[PDB]
Amino acid sequence: FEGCLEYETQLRRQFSLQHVRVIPGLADADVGGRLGIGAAHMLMSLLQPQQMLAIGFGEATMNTLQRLSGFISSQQIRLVTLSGGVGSYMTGIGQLNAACSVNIIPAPLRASSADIARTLKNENCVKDVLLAAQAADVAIVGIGAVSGYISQGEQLMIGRKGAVGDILGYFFDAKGDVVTNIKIHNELIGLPLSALKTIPVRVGVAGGENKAEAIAAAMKGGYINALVTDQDTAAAILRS
Amino acid sequence: EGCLEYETQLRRQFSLQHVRVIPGLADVGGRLGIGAAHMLMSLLQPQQMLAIGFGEATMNTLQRLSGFISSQQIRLVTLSGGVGSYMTGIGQLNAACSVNIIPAPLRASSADIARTLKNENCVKDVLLAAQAADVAIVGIGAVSGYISQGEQLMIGRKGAVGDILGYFFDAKGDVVTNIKIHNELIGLPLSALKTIPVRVGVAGGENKAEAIAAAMKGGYINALVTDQDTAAAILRS
Fold this sequence. Notes:
By secondary structure, chain A is an alpha/beta fold. Chain A has ten helices and ten strands.
């Protein structure tokens, strides 16, 4: 039969990934903390001293930063937020050393209207951070699945419009294309997915079998070109 | 030293609640941080809320207060936008500390944009939290890069002597009313800061005496941490 190493090889070839790690399904520990540890080990090998790491929001990325905090200080890694929201990055940034360089988009995650988001993106202190993010060497993001900032109603319509998952709040369909008649898209302050693709090494950290279709789609769209996930999710991706 | 005597005079002359005057007597700003952290350690009860301004005296203070903030579970909230400008201070706390940050720039490119930003739910929520704080800790600037060299010159021409949180006031302590940066700032205005019951100003340097006196006369702070020479200067203001 087949195990984690074989799932890594298959994922790597099937989605043309640059790096993949697949962690075993059960252990004496919950998946999400173990995803963090694994994403952290992958980033430690990928990042060179003084390089720049763009970070998304969410529990998996915040767990990852925690595990990476020592390497971040020791290796002088500069962190930059991929999205607005400020406070949503504090569980991961809090663990860092005071001398660590962190560049934070000083704006909300989501504006109340598209005109307001467009205004805020043009504010110099925000535009500067958006450019810095797009220029990073490596990115780490979570991946949400349609299976705080979005109402129940919006979530239901996002799904009716064919979204399967999101990165940074931007929703894409089963083929990996951004769903284009979704209003939240034009209201978000951070980097759009088309800009995220500038970053050369884009690591998704995500798991739960429920997320298989979203993770697959994210790779088919090109948004991530490296993956950290778990055994069961990997299997499900491969049959997607 | 003559420190207790300056404390008494300052307290009486400006009707202050608490005052500390540190010896003259070389690392001034470092010792003001110590001073103001000590004052805050005696004022804050467990789980109370501290509103913080930006600048180095305040960020210094925060470093020295960091273990008190953990063990007494002090909740921190930013008085202004800017985010990045608070990071040297908050980086020094651990990750179980509660820190509520205004998610917006310090200054918008126009007053309409400031006003739009202040009405965003996520900004407005933090502004209210800030105004509801138990104690505040701010620096005081003296007219003696969020602002042009050109702007700074016109701000002095308009009769400002000093600022708190980028809000400039004249020698009597009144907010200078024809300065457009005021309507571009995202944070709490000074009139709102005055809701907070204990408002501690931490500032020193003889050149700041006029600004510091004025801040007191306008009621923006009602507690002060400063150094001996500055105290002597304020009192002769």
